[PDB]
Amino acid sequence: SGAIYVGNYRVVNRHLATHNDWANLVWEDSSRDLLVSSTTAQGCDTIARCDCQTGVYYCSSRRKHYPVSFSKPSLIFVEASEYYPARYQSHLMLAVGHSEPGDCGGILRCQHGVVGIVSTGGNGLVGFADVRDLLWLDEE
Ligand SMILES: CNC(=O)[C@@H](c1cccc(C)c1)N1C[C@@H](C(N)=O)CC1=O
Numbered sequence: 624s625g626a627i628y629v630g631n632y633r634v635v636n637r638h639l640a641t642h643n644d645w646a647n648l649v650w651e652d653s654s655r656d657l658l659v660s661s662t663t664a665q666g667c668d669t670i671a672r673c674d675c676q677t678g679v680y681y682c683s684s685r686r687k688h689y690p691v692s693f694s695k696p697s698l699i700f701v702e703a704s705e706y707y708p709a710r711y712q713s714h715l716m717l718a719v720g721h722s723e724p725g726d727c728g729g730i731l732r733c734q735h736g737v738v739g740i741v742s743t744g745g746n747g748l749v750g751f752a753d754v755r756d757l758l759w760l761d762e763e
């Protein structure tokens with residue numbers, strides 16, 4: 624589990640969104656595994672606006688932050704899970720690192736701010752849904 628809290632927005636994995644998220648919906652995209660809802664209080668996270676390929680992510684199944692090198696956002700085939708059939712997920716970045724399904728939501732960050740959240744993994748890989756192209760998260 625986990626979210627990004629930027630401005631009056633809450634960014635979560637679409638497959639983990641709550642009823643309150645759907646009832647206060649700003650934007651969602653199944654192909655990216657992302658959903659954004661509105662919040663009453665202002666958050667403290669800032670979004671990175673960069674092309675970093677190194678950063679650090681939080682892994683809840685280890686209670687640890689790990690440094691990682693990650694690929695550029697791309698269209699990657701992801702195997703079937705209880706949340707989606709096997710399909711292509713867009714704007715996804717892969718790295719070598721530990722992950723388990725409940726690690727989704729952990730933040731990946733670089734020197735500039737939040738880059739994205741854990742969305743996929745297994746077999747010593749972890750995939751992150753990028754948010755750096757969502758420029759509207761910085762306004763409203
Ligand atoms: C092949 N299955 C997975 O990659 C697991 C998973 C497996 C291990 C670790 C993590 C973080 C997620 N996914 C991917 C998610 C998605 N975005 O489609 C839904 C899900 O359950």
Ligand SMILES: [Zn+2]
Nearest residue numbers: 673675733735
């Ligand atoms: Zn950066």
